[PDB]
Amino acid sequence: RTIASSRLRLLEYSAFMEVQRDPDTYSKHLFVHIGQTPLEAVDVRQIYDKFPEGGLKELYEKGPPNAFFLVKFWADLNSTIQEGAFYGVSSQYSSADSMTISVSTKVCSFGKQVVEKVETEYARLENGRFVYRIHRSPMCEYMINFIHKLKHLPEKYMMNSVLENFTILQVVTSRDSQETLLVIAFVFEVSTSEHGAQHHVYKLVKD
Amino acid sequence: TIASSRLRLLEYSAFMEVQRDPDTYSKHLFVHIGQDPPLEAVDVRQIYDKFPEGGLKELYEKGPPNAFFLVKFWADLNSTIQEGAFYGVSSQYSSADSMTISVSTKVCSFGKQVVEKVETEYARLENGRFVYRIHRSPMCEYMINFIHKLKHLPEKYMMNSVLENFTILQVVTSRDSQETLLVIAFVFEVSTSEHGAQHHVYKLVKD
Amino acid sequence: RTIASSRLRLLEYSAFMEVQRDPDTYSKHLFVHIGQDPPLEAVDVRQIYDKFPEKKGGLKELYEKGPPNAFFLVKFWADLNEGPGAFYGVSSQYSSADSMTISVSTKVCSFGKQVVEKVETEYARLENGRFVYRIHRSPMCEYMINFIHKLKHLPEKYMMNSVLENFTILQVVTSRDSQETLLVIAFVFEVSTSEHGAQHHVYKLVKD
Amino acid sequence: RTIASSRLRLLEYSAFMEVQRDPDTYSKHLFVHIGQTPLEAVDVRQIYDKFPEKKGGLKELYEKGPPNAFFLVKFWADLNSTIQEGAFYGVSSQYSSADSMTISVSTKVCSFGKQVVEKVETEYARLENGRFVYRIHRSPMCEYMINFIHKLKHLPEKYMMNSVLENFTILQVVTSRDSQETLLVIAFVFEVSTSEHGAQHHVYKLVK
Ligand SMILES: CNC(=O)c1cnc(OCCO)c(F)c1-c1c(Cl)c(F)cc2c1C[C@](c1ccccc1)([C@@H]1CCCN1)O2
Ligand SMILES: CNC(=O)c1cnc(OCCO)c(F)c1-c1c(Cl)c(F)cc2c1C[C@](c1ccccc1)([C@@H]1CCCN1)O2
Ligand SMILES: CNC(=O)c1cnc(OCCO)c(F)c1-c1c(Cl)c(F)cc2c1C[C@](c1ccccc1)([C@@H]1CCCN1)O2
Ligand SMILES: CNC(=O)c1cnc(OCCO)c(F)c1-c1c(Cl)c(F)cc2c1C[C@](c1ccccc1)([C@@H]1CCCN1)O2
Ligand SMILES: *C(=O)CCCCCCCCCCCCC
Ligand SMILES: *C(=O)CCCCCCCCCCCCC
């Protein structure tokens, strides 16, 4: 399903690990992935307790409400590649207007922000639209260590228990006006399916 | 003062701006390095304990040694303007060569990276040299809240005590090659002088 | 309202004075400001010709050369409500879809005569898929600073408006190498008497 | 002789008219020319009466300094009608500095010590052989100057041109655009050339 406010569209979002064993051998494992192409609503009060309290509530009140989405991820943490490994995030956005955007990714543990990454991006005019590409943004050591700790657990239900109190809040703003363009609240479980990583998108509402 | 063999820092300023009325604006500078006398050297091992294990030591070992500097700031946190206030950072760099730079600003508390902001800038030919201007980059909420918390302390010595374990590491790289162009370690105290904000620059060396 | 020809868009225009209160505190006063599209009212260019008598490089001559889409009239109600060391400046920004080197000529006319001309050349910068031209903090010439001071010393705002009837500014932006007219703005002035401060009104210049 | 302060050097200065009678015919007449190559001193108080006084004047600029930036140029302009005048009247000049900076060249034209017209041109440097060079190429003269040259040329005798020129002066002030620091100041005074060798000039260092 499509994640788009009236000002910005999320085209793609992937978090992955890449291994280049040698100059001729390359492997990539996707942890989570929202690829390029009806939404169910979720009351934002149902998730407030798990997010910062410039928190999710203040951001929602500031608006616009059409910019708010919840994504449930079932992350693939299976050791499918022999891990020099690179851990990264790639994402792509588009707008109708020519503007610089700022993508804030806040990582929270028990509702409290522990690390934050802020990336500004300039648009490329492409096919009449303005496209923003954040390509292979390295994951911070906190996240790489967190993934390694999860993978050392012997049971997927233990990974789910740890993940119950782990959340990510992505806030995209227009750099110069500081207007909220898109807000995505990410929640996680580990995937147990043969099809791998899965996701479900919901529109965040209030009343 | 601050220049490696590949990149020169022309200006750096952090400030708050208030709109008093539709035609009147006030600006308060917290810190400012404006636009050559010799620099005193500081052994980089004297500051590693506050910048421990992309860290300062790892970057310094990778080199070049001429790219590393330490700036001590005495920040002006006096309420000189009645604060909708904008908190921002403006900076300018220059080089003899045309390249795309990536500016990473890492905010650390007790030696741990809590926020990282990354901004990419494209060279502009100006007066026979290449200039990079990052104008009015908004401060993240973590920094605005940190400034507000410091200002609520009743004594300036308490602010200095909190600031003992707060550091900022700015790393400028050539975007495509990832070569280190300039690294600045920033450390802070609150200014108690009538002259306002002050700074002192040192060259980082390893005896 | 938006000032844009088919080749160049005016994003911002501000004239201001800046004062340093202490080493870390600066105050800025805007005299006039056009900040960052609703439709524009049209004004026949013959209704303003009598106030721009200057012939060579003047309004009528440029309008006749064209293109008509490049011509605008801005009415300003300037806010004239310091110490030594005050900075008087002008900041402006433009954008285009194409990469150009532009030349910005600002002609100041007083009592029907061109008294000052300031010329600035600007090189396109690729930003967000468009080309931006920024003329940041261009210092006002002493003639303009002294003119502002003389207006402020007048005891009545109607005397300021009478002196201002004879004062016009013509801004002509051209493509540097071809000398093609990209944008022409005729600026006319009054002093603001409102509590809201500086005001402006944009009109498109037409002929019949 | 060399016109250079510790921050800026004047390489060349020429005022001229060009006539392109047809696609194959070109003519150029130089009115004045300082081409690329000790100085006699003149006390700046000897010329104060002929230049702008009080605010932004020669005296105020001289007192602000640096004293090494101030020069007086006497010109004997060639006003002979040597070409059949569509003609273009222009000024071309070049400067150089050791530093990378944007300069602003103000040319004030004065009659009886009062500024009548001013042209301000900003220029960006080009890095050339380890020097930053500024070129103002074929800057069009304003109509005031073209009409003044035509009026002088209408006088039947050269002494009559010298009489009118007695109270005509040009003050060129070059500043660093962003800091407004004075880089170079040249006071120009004029007579008409009566020699077969044409246009002449003499450079003096202004002292106090
Ligand atoms: C306090 N409110 C909530 O816990 C909550 C309320 N309503 C939701 O959605 C409604 C639309 O269905 C949520 F998603 C969450 C939520 C939130 Cl806020 C969270 F931070 C983590 C988290 C969940 C659910 C869960 C998960 C399930 C599937 C995939 C990913 C995570 C579950 C929790 C048990 C183990 N796993 O982990
Ligand atoms: C353990 N080593 C250090 O602490 C250190 C060593 N040598 C330096 O420089 C050498 C040139 O002399 C430093 F700067 C620092 C340092 C560092 Cl690493 C830091 F993280 C914060 C910090 C300081 C100094 C200080 C400050 C004083 C004035 C202005 C700004 C900051 C002082 C600390 C007490 C309260 N304030 O805050
Ligand atoms: C001969 N034609 C004109 O005078 C004219 C005609 N039509 C206009 O607009 C049509 C859309 O409205 C104009 F603007 C002007 C004009 C022009 Cl050309 C000018 F050089 C100055 C000037 C004015 C009007 C004025 C002013 C008012 C408000 C703000 C600024 C200036 C008025 C004049 C009395 C005091 N103030 O000063
Ligand atoms: C009041 N002080 C002066 O008049 C003065 C004093 N001392 C000078 O020089 C010292 C080094 O000799 C001057 F140059 C000038 C001066 C100045 Cl300020 C001026 F505005 C015009 C002007 C002159 C001289 C003159 C001229 C002669 C030759 C060439 C160009 C001009 C002469 C005057 C009669 C006709 N022509 O026209
Ligand atoms: C540090 O700066 C981290 C930047 C944000 C990384 C987001 C990647 C999260 C998706 C991976 C899913 C792993 C299961 C928790
Ligand atoms: C209008 O903007 C004029 C700009 C300055 C023109 C300077 C040329 C003066 C030299 C010509 C000598 C003619 C004798 C008076």
Author numbering:
A (entry chain B): 218 to 254, 262 to 277, 280 to 309, 312 to 435
B (entry chain D): 219 to 253, 260 to 277, 280 to 309, 312 to 435
C (entry chain C): 218 to 253, 260 to 304, 309 to 435
D (entry chain A): 218 to 254, 262 to 309, 312 to 434
The study reports:
The four highly conserved paralogs of the TEA/ATSS domain transcription factor (TEAD1–TEAD4) are the most distal effectors of the Hippo signaling pathway that regulate cell growth, tissue homeostasis and embryonic development. TEAD transcriptional activity is dependent on protein–protein interactions (PPIs) with cofactors, of which yes-associated protein (YAP) and its paralog transcriptional coactivator with PDZ-binding motif (WWTR1/TAZ) are the two most important coactivators, and vestigial-like family member 4 (VGLL4) is a prominent co-repressor. The YAP–TEAD protein–protein interaction mediates YAP oncogenic functions downstream of the Hippo pathway. The YAP/TAZ–TEAD complex has recently become a druggable oncology target, with the first inhibitors being a variety of allosteric binders of the TEAD lipid pocket (LP), whose binding prevents post-translational autopalmitoylation of a conserved internal cysteine that is essential for TEAD maturation and function.
